[PDB]
Every structure is written in C-alpha cells, then in structure tokens.
From Swiss-Prot:
It catalyses: a long-chain fatty acid + ATP + CoA = a long-chain fatty acyl-CoA + AMP + diphosphate; hexacosanoate + ATP + CoA = hexacosanoyl-CoA + AMP + diphosphate; tetracosanoate + ATP + CoA = tetracosanoyl-CoA + AMP + diphosphate; hexadecanoate + ATP + CoA = hexadecanoyl-CoA + AMP + diphosphate. Homodimer. The chain holds residues 1 to 396 of 503 of the full protein. GO terms for biological process: biological process involved in interaction with host; fatty acid biosynthetic process; response to acidic pH. This is Long-chain-fatty-acid--CoA ligase FadD13. Required for maintaining the appropriate mycolic acid composition and permeability of the envelope on its exposure to acidic pH. Catalyzes the activation of long-chain fatty acids as acyl-coenzyme A (acyl-CoA), which are then transferred to the multifunctional polyketide synthase (PKS) type III for further chain extension. It has preference for the fatty acid with long chain length in the following order: hexacosanoic acid (C26), tetracosanoic acid (C24) and palmitic acid (C16). It is an enzyme of class 6 (ligase). GO terms for cellular component: cytosol; peptidoglycan-based cell wall; plasma membrane. The lineage of its organism: Bacteria, Bacillati, Actinomycetota, Actinomycetes, Mycobacteriales. Its EC number is 6.2.1.3.
C-alpha cells in the first residue's frame, strides 16, 4: 500500500539535508527533514482538533510550506484535504465546506473576511467545529509533537477532494486517493526529464490539482521546490536566475508575456531547462522564441479528474505536431469513445482516459460518477481526434 505521507518521510530519510521548499519573498528555506518534521507537527495539531481517518480538513490559504505540510500531515493521518480557491466568494466556499462535510477549516490572513462572513450569518456549514487562522495555526504548531504518526492507512483511502464544475448546477468534488496521486506523481516523474536535486519553480495556486501533484512528485524525486506565493511576471526571471531554477510551470499566456519584459532581452539562466505548459497548445512562434534561448517546452492535457496527469507532447514534436495535446505517457493511456459507444485507439470521438491517476468518484454524486466511467475508461467530456502516429488533438 502506498501512502503520500510516508513518502515524505522516506524522502527525509534519503535526503535529510536536501532543500525541499525555498520561498524568497518570505525568507523561508526548509529542508526535507524539516518539512517532514513540520508535517508531523501539523498531524499532531490536526488530531488535537478532532481530525481522524476519513475526516475532511479544508485549506483556504496562500501558497506556503504550511499548506504543504498540512496535507502531508493529513496524509499521514489518513485524513482528507479539501484545498479551496481563495478567489471565490463566501457563498461558493460555504457550499464546498458544506458539500464536503469538512470538520475543520484552516485559512490564511487574506481570506479571513470570507471566513468571518460565512461565520457571521445564514445557514453556516454545520460540520465545521473549528476555524483556524494563521496566528492560531502558528500557536498550535508551537506546542505540537514532531514524532511520526502511527496510522495504518493509504492505498485507496481518500486523500483529496478537489472541486471543479464551472457551468451551473453546482461544483463537483473530485475525490483522489493516495494511489491515484502516487500514480500521477510517478507518471510525471518518469515522463519528463526531471532529476534529483533539480530546483522547480511553482508559480501556480496550490489549490489547483496540477500544483498539488507537482509538490508531491517534487518530494518523490527529491526536488527543491521554488515558490512565488504572489505571482509577479515582472520578477519571475530574477527568481528563476537567483534560485537556479531548472524547471518551471506556466500557461502560454504567461510565457508570451515573460519574453516581452526587458529582462528577457538576453538573460543568462544556464540552469533553466524547460517550461511545462498546460491549457491551450503553444503556437509555433512562441515556441521558436523560447527555443532561441535554448529553453524547451513540453505541453500536456489533463483534468482535475486525472489528478493533473494525462498526455504530453514532447519538446521534439513541439513544431512538427503544432496544436497537438501529445500522446500517452508513463502509466497513462488515451483513446476515443465513438458516438456508437465504441472505444478506439485511433479516429475521433470523446477523449477517454484509463490510468491509475483517475479519481475514485465524484464526492457524493452517484449518478455523475456512473456516467463518467465506461468500463475502466474515464469520459473527459472533451471531443478530439487521435491520428495515425497516435497524436491527440482536442476540439471542444
């Protein structure tokens, strides 16, 4: 049985003195050994707040080491973290908290007004027994034990509930387990050219599935995570050069912008190797420009339902296969469901995925869960085409 929490501990056993989290803007540079110790302290605090195996703990906060150590500590307890977008209004949060039945909510100073609001009136989520702010978490951590929790859990046990649906009805909670997450981390770690002691920049919100699995596989491979809590495209390059960043994540929007800045002119970052792109496929031009700086780019297609895992278009095909979402990667297969209910590895129809990175179920959405699956394959809801050479092209 795999356990995301225990993996953090083994990483601290293998590379105790390796840098695990570096956040310049807040002067926080921690080691794996230390991050694990902080994770243990989070576990102790969580158990003290009545959190037990299966219970949900909501996280509404800025990217930080405490965010990470909180879900890691939750992982070691067999608890379930529910990371929330810090940009949505109080009524959407309340809904998520109520839907997930979160017992405890931990929030950062900048979202205190959303909590104080949900706290003040209406029909407040009745399951929440404790609302812990930044200073309070600080205090509790100070008197928390740092020993390893002893809880037999992992494998198929729930670990994360990530909400998504943007249309109407209501948001849907994607439940992920220790295994699906472990599997997603592994897929990225074995697919891309990522190596021990690499320094990877994480500019994306920790509540996004992509950022979560990045943190996880950073720990799996022994990568020093480089953070920028408040993304500032005017300072990115400096951070990248100062902390010797080898790998970075970004949306084609950002990248295109990042090469406008005067800094870009001729920056010297011999350590930076490539950007990992999500969302919309990179255009020829945008790729050629980065290629001129010996910086390559790889792009992928993934959903929250796929734990941020999926297809990947390797750098070498960046131009030859312009707008393609890539091909299968380690441990993840892709196919297309024909309008006749038949699943083919070539042709067109609805993109489907078969991989241990897939969610277990949508949180309390029986009907939704049944339709998403078709004999082991998950239905993405995206139409696409997989050509001869096996390259995927999304349509709508």
């Amino acid at each position: 049985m795999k356990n995301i929490g225990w993996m953090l501990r083994q990483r601290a056993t293998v590379s105790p003195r390796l840098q695990a989290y570096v956040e310049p803007s807040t002067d926080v540079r921690m080691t794996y050994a230390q991050m694990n110790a902080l994770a243990n302290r989070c576990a102790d605090v969580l158990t003290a707040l009545g959190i037990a195996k299966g219970d949900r703990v909501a996280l509404l906060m800025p990217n930080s080491v405490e965010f990470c150590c909180l879900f890691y500590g939750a992982a070691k307890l067999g608890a379930v973290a529910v990371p929330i977008n810090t940009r949505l209004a109080a009524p959407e949060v309340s809904f998520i908290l109520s839907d997930s039945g979160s017992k405890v909510v931990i929030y950062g100073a900048p979202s205190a007004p959303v909590i104080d609001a949900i706290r003040a009136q209406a029909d407040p989520p009745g399951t929440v027994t404790d609302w812990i702010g930044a200073d309070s978490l600080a205090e509790r951590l100070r008197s928390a034990a740092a020993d390893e929790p002893a809880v037999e859990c992992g494998g198929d046990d729930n670990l994360f509930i990530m909400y998504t649906s943007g249309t109407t009805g209501h948001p849907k909670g994607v439940v992920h387990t220790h295994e699906s997450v472990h599997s997603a981390a592994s897929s990225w770690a074995s697919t891309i050219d990522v190596r021990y002691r690499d320094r990877l920049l994480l500019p994306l919100p920790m509540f996004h599935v992509a950022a979560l699995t990045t943190v996880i596989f950073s720990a799996m491979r022994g990568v020093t995570l480089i953070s920028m809590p408040q993304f500032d495209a005017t300072k990115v390059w400096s951070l990248i050069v100062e902390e010797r960043v080898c790998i970075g994540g970004a949306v084609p929007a950002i990248l295109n912008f990042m090469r406008q800045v005067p800094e870009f002119a001729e920056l010297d970052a011999p350590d930076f190797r490539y950007f990992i792109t999500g969302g919309a496929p990179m255009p020829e031009a945008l790729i050629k420009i980065y290629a001129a700086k010996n910086i390559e780019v790889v792009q992928g297609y993934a959903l929250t339902e796929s734990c941020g895992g999926g297809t990947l278009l390797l750098s070498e095909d960046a131009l030859r296969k312009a707008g393609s979402a890539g091909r299968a990667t380690m441990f993840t297969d892709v196919a297309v469901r024909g309008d006749d209910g038949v699943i083919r590895e070539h042709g067109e129809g609805e993109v489907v995925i078969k991989s241990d990175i897939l969610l277990k179920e949508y949180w309390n959405r029986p009907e939704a869960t049944r339709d998403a699956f078709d004999n082991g394959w998950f239905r993405t809801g995206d139409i696409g085409e997989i050509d001869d050479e096996g390259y995927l092209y999304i349509k709508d």
